[model samples]
Every structure is written in structure tokens, then in C-alpha cells.
Target: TCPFYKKIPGTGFTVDAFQYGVVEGCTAYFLTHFHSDHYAGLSKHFTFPVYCSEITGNLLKNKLHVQEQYIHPLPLDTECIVNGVKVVLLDANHCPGAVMILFYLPNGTVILHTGDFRADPSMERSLLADQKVHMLYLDTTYCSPEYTFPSQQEVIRFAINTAFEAVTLNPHALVVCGTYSIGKEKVFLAIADVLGSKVGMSQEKYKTLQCLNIPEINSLITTDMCSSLVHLLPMMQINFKGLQSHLKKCGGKYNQILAFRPTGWTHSNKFTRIADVIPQTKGNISIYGIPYSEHSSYLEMKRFVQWLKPQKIIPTVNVGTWKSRSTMEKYFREWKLEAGY
Candidate 1:
């Protein structure tokens, strides 16, 4: 009933399905990225072999402490044989270690498991450009006609510009950025660099960034609470009451706080443009819900699926509801027809 509930047909592989006890015929487990939702049930004690991108492998070993031998780090854009299938990893452009897996099955069928991605034109240069993909297990996180937003670059710039404006408005204001453990490193890093201020976060979060090996982030991070005005905290802590409590916890060091909460869920059809999704304020605490999502938007998915022209398309999210499922299928039918496949 769920997207990852079953294995890829004709292959003994299960992807991002760690929560579902091992499949009956599964010989190998594949992880697309290191996000908590995708690697939900993975643990240090588990002994199953899992394949993923090298960056994701490092995160698994460091963050989850999974055994080294059990982690298979596949080379990107290169073909390699695993079990009985030929496979390759392509940049998913979603997060630090995310990848779109391409599988060459025994029966001349090619399958692409796009774990979670923000569809990009660079994918056209990859090996997938020429090869025919028979099946596509898509991210489908924002697979609805109404979900439309700007590009990732545009959103990141908007966040940076917004942060600058907020800081300029209140010179002594503290800027708070909402982030996941893995994704959205770009936004805060850019803000920190442009503002030329130290980025503050908990020690554990700083440790997690070491796995990413980003020099820009490494130089900007500080554990000292008073050392930086720009703090990167978990998304949950970016809300009105949370920011107020956090400011209070800081002993009135900052009179006002500006926060950015970036995600796909913040979108609504009522907003005609991305610029219309403005910031909400409760007293000194202001939170800007930026449409800075890692997952592909509806129009992006429409363009990607039409270009792929896959014989069959599988939605990887919003599958639990029958109505949602039917809507996605209708979209797919129209896309397939448009592609003339």
C-alpha cells in the first residue's frame, strides 16, 4: 500500500524500505540517501548489505554507525554489477548524498529508482540520456497540478536576500535557519557566507556536517552560543513560540529574531506567486516559510516523466490515499500520451 512496500519487480532488491521487514525474495537492500524517513528502520545492529552513494555511505557509518562491510559505496556515473544486475548511481540533486539509481535488469529492462530529487536539466548529460528506461520509480512528493514553485537556486537566493533585509531592518536581530540533519545545507551556508557571520548550531549537528566535507560550512560553524547571530536549528525550533523560548533562553541577547522555515508543504494554491508566500510574525518573532523544497515540483515531474517516456511509472509518495493515487495516475496517463510512448 506504501511506495516502498514492495521490491522492484524482477529484481531481488528493496530500496529505502528499511522499515518494512526484509522482503521474501530480496537479496540486496538499497538506500537512496541518508534522510531519516528513507532510512527509518536502519540500525547499527542490522547486518544486511546496503548500496548507496559514497557520501551517503559515510553518513551511515558516521551518523548511524552501521558496519563498514555492510555498506556498499557505489561510484557515481559508472556501471557496476551487483548480485545479477548492472547498476549505476546518478546525482539526485536533492541533498548532499542523494542519488537516482539506474538498474539494468537481466531481461533488457532498465529501471530508474529516483529516491527523492529536484529534477534538473543536468540529468540529461548523464548516461540515462541515451538509454531507454522501462520503469521509473519516481519521488512523487509534490505530484499534484496545484503544487508549483520556483527553482531551488531562485529560492535559495530569496532566502539569502530575505535574511539580508531582515538583518538590515533590525541590525541586532538574530537570524535563525530551519534545517534537517542532511538537507538544506546550501541555504544557511549561503546566508552565513553572504552575511559574513559565524553559523551557530549544536555540536552534534556540527559533527554531522563533517561527514559532508564542505569547507564553506566547516569554516562558518561555531558551537559557542554568543559567537554568532545566525543560528541553524532543527526545523521544529523555528516556530513562533519556539523562537520566543529560544530567544528567552539566550537571556535577551537579541531583541528580535528572523527565521526561515523552508519546505514543500508550505505551498498553497491561493498564492499566485512564490513571492506572495510572505513571512508570519508574532511580536518580535518572524518566520518566513520559503518554498525551498528538495523534492521535484509538479511541473518539474511532468517535464521529467514526459522526457523519460518510461513504459510504466510508479509514484513513490502519497500512495496511501486512493483518490490521490487516482489523481497521480491520471496525470501519468496524460503525460505518457503527450510523450507518444
Candidate 2:
């Protein structure tokens, strides 16, 4: 996601998060998020200067244990210069401290790397800025037309209500909501504040929430199993077996356990490419799948391009090169399926 760093000749920037595009020998480094896929392969081995948000900076030195001196924290919407190249950061709305990086080259070309983001129209003007986006490193996470989800607010609200309803039906049952290691704190905060109950999380997650310090998070956090009623487990841990294990261990604490998976992948069928989210039950646990995601859908990417009007669009994590040109030459040759973006 740079000028001299990538296909561009002289822009000396490198954005190697997850999978946009990074190195640390001569030029500065940038991080879009703390997701393992986005910020992996970074450490003191190839140590160099790094620029990222404060929350991500904490993850670097505190969690990943990168050198502090090499990490420079930049506030969002603020302008900074690196080797004479200007850069700006915007909230990606993906995970805490995730960002969309805008690089203003000396040549005046404005390049944007969404870095796994959902389309929020309210932030479009800020995203487009005052120049045309020459090239967009887009997040194609949900690029297929099958993926369409409701807003996160609506999904979280439904989840909270359903969780309460579950507890209402079985007061002795424990409700366990799922989230990624870093994202989906909003769901936890809402359930905690609305239910007037503190959230139980792992020590690793506690440090993350502590660093984020969202007003929604409070000191009511706990790690004790006895104090845990509503558990916030990592998305993978909230499965049926995990809930069963928890129930078996905490026989007196609860007789039943219901697990909820608040993830976008709940809608994506890895094999069939089916997209949906609803309350489904199987075996011993009742799991509610919420359509909350940090990435944009096919419709969103289309609307985003129609408004922003970029000349060239590149998928963030693909080996294909479609619509990489304005002419749509070879791209439209196979565009018999969809209308256009």
C-alpha cells in the first residue's frame, strides 16, 4: 500500500499487514491491525521503525513484545511525514486499533489501503479525502455476492435480547458469547452494560480491553470461573464441545450452557459459499449466529467504488487481476454474471 515501495517507483513506503503489503531494512513500517494474519512476521529480527495507532502500539510492545523505541504511535486523522511522504490514518472499524491508511505521495497521488473494513458511509468523505484515489487495496473478505449482513448495531442488539431470553427460559443456564481475540468488544460491552453484569474473560483478553479502554468497558472485568456467568470466549472456544466441557466442570455454577457465535464467517460457507445468520441448535448447545463483520460485502464494495470512482481496484488478498484497469478490457470479457462495481 505504498508508492515507492510497491509497483510505484519512488514512494519509499511499505505496508505489509496480514497478507496489504511490508520490510524493515531501509524504509519505515506500517501496521493496519493486530490480527495475526495482518501483522505477522514482524519482530526484532528485521527490526525497523514502525507507525501505528496507540492501541496497536500496545499490542506490538506489550503483546507481541516488539521493541518500544521502534514503535511510533500516531493518532487517527492526524497527518505525519515519513521520509518526505505524507500519511493519514482512519478507523478501519474492523478491530480495535484497526485502520485504513491513506498515503499522499510526493507526486500528489492519494492511495488508500482499506485493510479489512466495512463500508460506513458516514466516514466516506473522510476516506475519499480531497483527491482521487489512484489505487485502492480493497478488502475482498466478503467480495462474493452471497454475503450480505445487517448492521453491527442491529446484530448486537438482537444478540443481547436473545441472550436474555435464553437466560429467562433457563435461569440456571449460563450464556456464553463468542468473539475474536481482539475484535467484537462492542458485543461484550453491550451485554455487560445491559444485563448489569460484569464480563468474564481470559487474562489475555483483559489486557486487550484494558489497553483499548473504550468507555463501554469498565473495571467490572473478571477472570475467576466462579464469577463467570456470561463468558466471553474466543470465537473458536465457544463451540458446542467447549460449552459442554464448561458445564461439566461447573456443575453447581450452571446446569446448561448456550453458546453464541458473533462472527461474519457464520454466514460464509467455506465449502458451499452460503451466507446467513440465525439461531440454530445442535446436539447439546443452542448457538446463535450473529451477522456482525469487520469487512465489506459485495454490495458494499460496489457502492464504495461507484462513489469513490477509483481508476484501478486491487483485491487485498488475491492473486487475480480483474478491473485493474479503467478500460475493463479482459475484466468485462468474463463479467457476464454481475452488472458492475
Candidate 3:
């Protein structure tokens, strides 16, 4: 239906489904992660063989509910061939099921697709020393000076301090912080580590973490660990006043509650209603504003681009959609280079 490898009208050389036509005839579709933007149209429209880490495959099947037949699960840091294309999976570290894919083309071009990676030195050092990266299809979501994210470790520290403050201030309070299951699992782990015991997790989160097979980290807590100190609550427990009311009716004994949410509260006008419910007391149901994003910050992204020194740096996701392309264009132009769509 479309020419082979032709760039889409607005997306530069990144071909649309019609052009690449799924993973059947092509070399392969190296899925970097299971984020919605990354795999948005793949399941319904593109029925090609998708390759990713084994954890990613399971996530797509169990969490995203994608068909199992089309997914080919590869182990992390292992090389595998699909349809004569050599591929390797590296840790993206953005999320538990996330990955960075290296495509070793037949023409000897090594393309590194970094799917929403942070600026962790360990991750950078690992990728830098692992291979000679050529073209880098990077995640430039926050590739501007205006945005900056604290290091993951720093965010964890903040979370621990905040949680401790919330708990000590109110012994009978329920603390609920919102975080993505796979991406922010480390935050919860940090809480447990600081509290000197494993925090209780919901059955769903427990199962999700179990599927990753990271035994050492996963075994830090078990069902029995959840008996005291912390409770792994669901997202619904703190989203609205109605839910909060229902929870209060049944288990309102805890006057002080701590909750964290990954989705920012400023997204919509309705957020005001939720904000209105906040207790005036300093430690009573405090909502801490911690900017723990998975994507790289402006400076970190710039650094990554500089490191790769790619012939062409393509901004694959979140470019020219909700975010403007001109923002990234300035960076490219300032650096004396052009950014592909």
C-alpha cells in the first residue's frame, strides 16, 4: 500500500503502517517499550512480529492484552535474530518492561533506538561501552532548557523523606502515593528500604512485579510483609472525593493519609475538586509534588544526543502532537544539526 521505508508526511523517515506494513515482510519491528505512544497502533493495524525483552512481551500480553502469537520475547542483554535481522535488547531503565533496541542492519549500520531513557550515569556508561551506536532514534519529550527532572535516586530519596514525614506525623493515617506500576516500582522499593521493612503491595502490583523475574528485588517483600507498616492501595482509593468518602466510611480510622499519583493534578479543570478535598492540617493527607518522570530532561537529552553524535537524530514519539516540534527544532538548530520527525 505504501513505498518501502518512505518517510511519513510529518514524521520524516519514520514510516507509517502502510509503508512498513507490519513486521511480516520487513526485517523486524524492534519495540523499545510498551508505552502507549510507542505501541499505539501496532496491535490493531500492524500485525507484524514484534520483538522485545521477555518482560515486555509478557506485559503486552497480560497488561496491555495484546495477542500473544505476534510477540517474540527476547532476554535482556541477549542477541537474537528475527527474519535475518540481528537485534539486541538493552536496558532502557525508564520502566521495568522498557528496553532500548539496537538494530544491526545488513548494511552494517547500527541504529540505537532509545525508548524513553533517563540520564542515569550507569545506563549511559553501559550503553556507551556496549556498542558503537550510529543513528539514534531518541525520546526527546522534554528536550528543552525549560524542563528538568531530578535523578531517579534523588527522587527516591525525596519520596522516602516525604513518606516518613507523612507517617510520623500521623500514625493512624493512610498514605497513598500514585505511581505507575512498572515504571515507579523502584519508588515503592525505596520506601520499603528506608522503612527497614517491605511495604505492602496490591495483589495486582505484586503479580506484575513477579512476572519481571527480578528475584532478588522482588523477594525483598512477600504477602506476610504487608501485614503492617504499609498497605498497597489501588489508584481508585484516592482519585476522587466519592472514592475517598467510601473509603472513609469503611476505614476512616486513619486520619492522616499519604498518596502519590503519576498523572499530574494540573491536567484538567476537574483536578480542582480533588484538590479541594485536601485537609488544611500540615500532615493530614498531604500531597507531595515530586517530579519523577521517566523520560530524560532537557539537559540530559542534549547530553545523550551529543554522546551519540548520530548522523540523523529522529524524535520518534510525542513530537508535533501534544508537544510542539519547534521546541526541539531550536535545540537541533542551535547545535548546527537538523532533527528528523
Candidate 4:
């Protein structure tokens, strides 16, 4: 019924956001967010309606320069009909405007497509509404129960205050933060408000934030031509190899270069159970991995599965190695949650 979609009989393909051939058809393209991975084949010249959050459409407008007619705004909990199919967007706490797609089919079948989400206790009430669900598509990025992230408030406080206080302790030492192309805007805003600092980014990154005209930061205050105490760079570029060369010239001038990464994968090693920070000291660099993720953990996933109890579960993040849905289920079902919770 699809190139690789979780096909429904009467309703549309549960989603078609990441496909290459999502250009021309009667296909229903439901975009979850503006993340590069999810929006793989999207471009400035698409010829179909892209259903997504208003923020995602805005990002695509700025990034792709496409016609506004093609981009339809689907807000959370606002049930609407599209192509004769019942659709509702649910708030997914993964990123700024990330959402989970909920489809109420013609045959009384409710399908929940969790697109890259972080499960929270608050969302449980809304999630448990549909008990007669036929299928549940999961974003099983962290299927194993080894990952145990703390609450969101704690993680946010830890991430923002960790970096801000580190630089404050020693005036000369610079604080570098790691973030994805679209996420961690709150952390950037946090530093700006608390420390009175404007983060420096590349020209492209600067523009990306400006397009995210949300209430927290209507017009994002950033710098591409200038430098600041807290430097905001790409997530992949915050590693030791990426920053070490630059630190060479700026070393010994301050206490130390401290790096803060707010992500789900905080623990580096699964054997001895290292909590945070890959290594105490990687030469003159001090790294700290704060458990601030927009995605769900093993326990949260389990809770979701237990609560929803769909007839079948499909792993959204497809790996060619897995033979079947049962194989994927076995991989997750076999793992036990970490003892301490």
C-alpha cells in the first residue's frame, strides 16, 4: 500500500514525511517537524499539501521559499478532515513544534504515529483517550531500558545553569553548547536572559533561529559576525576533534574550556554505568552531558505501550537488519528497565 508507509485501508498513509518520491500524487504528506532527518526529500518546489505544525510550515517557508498554499497548518488537538480522512495533531515534546500524528480512520480504527517524541507524564491523559487503536507506530530510537533521564525541569535547570555558572565561575573561560539544527532554542534563550549573553553562530544558523518566531524568542537574538561568551554551534561539531584545534590558540588564557551537551544519550558507557560526561578531562576540555532530551526513554516507551496497548506496534525508525515486527518487538520486550528508576 506504500513505498514504506504504515498503510491504512481507507485512510491515507499514516505518514509520508521522509520519502524521496513525496512530490506528485494523491499522497497525503504529514510532516512531523522541520528536522532534517524527517524532511529528507522536501524542497522549495513541492507540489502537494504538507500537513504539519504552524512552526514547521514557517520553517519550511523560510528554508524552502515554497508557496504558502502548499503548506497547511495543523495545530495540536484541532481535529480536521484532510482528503476525506480524519486527522488530529498531538503535541510531541521532542522539539519546538514536533507533533505526533493521530488518524481516526473511517472503519473506527485509530492509528497513532509517534514521530520522534519525548513522552511525558503530562501527555498521558491525552494519549490514553483512544483505547480502540489498531496500530501504534513508535519512534524506537532508544528501545533499550538502559537510558534513565531525569525530569524535564531538572534537566533544563541542569543544562542552562551548568553552562552559565561554569563561565561565571571563571570570567575568561568560554562555554560551548551542542545543539541540533532546530532544537535547544530554550537553552540559547536561557543563556541570553540569565547571563546577558548573545550566542554566536554561523550565518545560516543565525537565520534558522530568526525564522523560529515563537513567543519565547519572536525575533531570535544571535550573532554570526561577532563572538560571545557562550558560543552556539552545531551538535556534531561540539566534539573534542571539532573544538580542540580552536582551543589551542585560546588555552591557558582562562580556567578551562567547558562543553555542555543537552541530549538524551547522556551516558557514554553502558558497562560501568557512567552517569554524565564522557571523560572527566579530555586534555584541557571539560565535557558535561546533561540529560535534557525531547525524546522518550525506555520506561516512558514501556508506559506508553502499556497504556495504549495497540493491536500491533511498528518501529518507525526502520533498520534493515530487523527481519520483522516481531523481531523488533522482541528486541525491546526482552530488555528490563534499569533497577534504580
Best by TM-score: 1
lDDT (tens digit, per residue) of candidate 2 on 29-145: 677888887676776544577888898998888777888888889988877877788888998878889998888877767788887788878667784556788777777666655
Task: Give all candidate RMSDs, comma-separated.
Answer: 2.0, 4.6, 6.1, 4.3
How many angstroms is residue 96 displaced in model 4 relative to the true structure, after the best TM-score fit?
A: 1.5
Clashing pairs in 4: 118-295, 118-296
The TM-scores, one per candidate, come to 0.93, 0.84, 0.76, 0.83
Worst 10 residues of 3 by lDDT: 4-13
Q: lDDT, candidate 1, residue 59?
A: 91
lDDT tens readout by residue for model 1, 1-341 = 22454478788898888887766777898999888988998889878889998889889898899999999998898989999789998999888989988989888898898998989777877798878998888888888877777887888778788889878888889989888668888788888878889889898888888787676565778898788888988887788778888998888778998888876655363465666557787898888777677888788888888888889888788887999899889999888777798
lDDT of each: 0.83, 0.70, 0.61, 0.70
Number of clashes recorded per candidate:
0, 7, 12, 2
Candidate 2 worst ten-residue window by lDDT = 327-336
Candidate 2: the clashing residue pairs are 4-10, 4-11, 15-21, 16-21, 16-22, 18-37, 18-38
lDDT-based ranking, best first? 1, 4, 2, 3
Give me the runs in candidate 2 sitting further than 4 Å from their true place: 1-9, 17-26, 44-46, 265-284, 320-341
Could you arrange the candidates by TM-score from highest to lowest? Answer: 1, 2, 4, 3
Pick by TM-score: 3 or 4, better one:
4
Q: Residue-wise lDDT of candidate 3 within 147-265, one digit each (tens)?
A: 65456666666677777876777666555556444677776677766666666666677667676767686546555422445555555565456335534653545665566654422
